[PDB]
């Protein structure tokens, strides 16, 4: 752990799955394609002026993607935003800051 660095990977929890669900519409938007469920498998967090979640998800065809979801600080009253994503990922790829 380093200042502004990403945490150790942790296996996904329902909260993380929830973040993926909430954010799914935005991903479909960027990629053009549409998804059955995305299974949240593992994630890392990075503290900024708010929080970046880096989540590894599975498309259910053994395809994996890495999502970057920004959670704003308490007073900004903004919902979760997908600020980045990477497609065509390996089950064992490390989650890294991008």
């Amino acid at each position: 752990m380093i200042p502004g660095g990403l945490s150790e990977a942790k296996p996904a929890t329902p909260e993380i799955q929830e973040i993926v669900d909430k954010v799914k519409p935005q991903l479909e938007e960027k990629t053009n394609e549409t998804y059955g469920k995305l299974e949240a498998v593992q994630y890392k967090t990075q503290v900024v002026a708010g929080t970046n979640y880096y989540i590894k998800v599975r498309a259910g065809d053994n395809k994996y993607m890495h999502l970057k979801v920004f959670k704003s600080l308490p007073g900004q009253n903004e919902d979760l935003v997908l600020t980045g994503y990477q497609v065509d990922k390996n089950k064992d790829d490390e989650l890294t800051g991008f």
Binding site: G4, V47, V48, A49, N52, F70
Partner: protein
């Protein structure tokens, strides 16, 4: 040592800034401490470029918006022979091409000093006699995000796993008794809308709470 210290009252501290979605706290902490030491040296307070640090200090081991260390920033300033002002090299919260220009350099250092790790008394002495001090802490808890006022104390905080870099600009106590309710006065880099006008008081002399004295340092000017 004074029972209270607040370097803002002596003109050492710029307005609170905002790192936004970039993991560049280490750069805000570093420029904060360097702003203080340059002010101590010259009596002139000049806001310094975190973007310069983000773009240019990978050779010293930092990783831009993916994290870094205040010591590595002070080392970059030493090896580089300078650091530009914010006004000349503005912050955009993303990793970009290094645009350091020596003719716009407004700060220098010759390296840095580490405060004895884990030692809040050493940290207090440093704050009282040097100026604002760069520190790393555990800031990843929900309670910290929701902080608004008072002395922050999080029973889950780690003294060891530190995910944020901030600036100690003084210390003191709430109430009449100088050894009760003691706190570190900390400048954050999440804008003046967060916390108490961008500041937060962290529990002091409570077993190195959130690792505030684990990895503190300041540039040598």
């Amino acid at each position: 040592l004074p029972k209270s210290v607040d370097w803002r009252k002596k003109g050492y501290v710029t307005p609170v800034k905002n790192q936004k979605q970039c993991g560049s706290c280490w750069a805000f902490s570093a420029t904060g401490a360097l702003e203080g030491q340059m002010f101590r040296k010259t009596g002139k307070l000049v806001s310094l470029s975190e973007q310069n640090l983000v773009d240019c200090s990978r050779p010293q081991g930092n990783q831009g918006c993916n994290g870094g260390f205040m010591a590595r920033a002070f080392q970059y300033v030493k090896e580089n022979g300078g650091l530009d002002s914010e006004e000349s090299y503005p912050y955009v919260a993303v990793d970009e091409i290094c645009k350091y220009r020596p003719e716009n350099s407004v700060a220098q250092d010759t390296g840095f000093t580490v405060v004895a790790p884990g030692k809040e008394k050493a940290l207090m002495k440093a704050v009282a006699t040097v100026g604002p001090i760069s520190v790393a802490m555990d800031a990843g808890h929900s309670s910290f995000q929701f902080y608004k006022s008072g002395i922050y104390f999080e029973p889950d905080c780690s003294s060891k796993n530190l995910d944020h870099g901030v600036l100690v600009v003084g210390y003191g106590f709430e109430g009449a008794n100088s050894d009760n309710s003691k706190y570190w006065l900390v400048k954050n880099s999440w804008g003046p809308e967060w916390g108490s006008n961008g500041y937060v008081k962290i529990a002091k002399d409570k077993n190195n709470h959130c690792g505030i004295a684990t990895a503190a340092s300041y540039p040598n000017v």
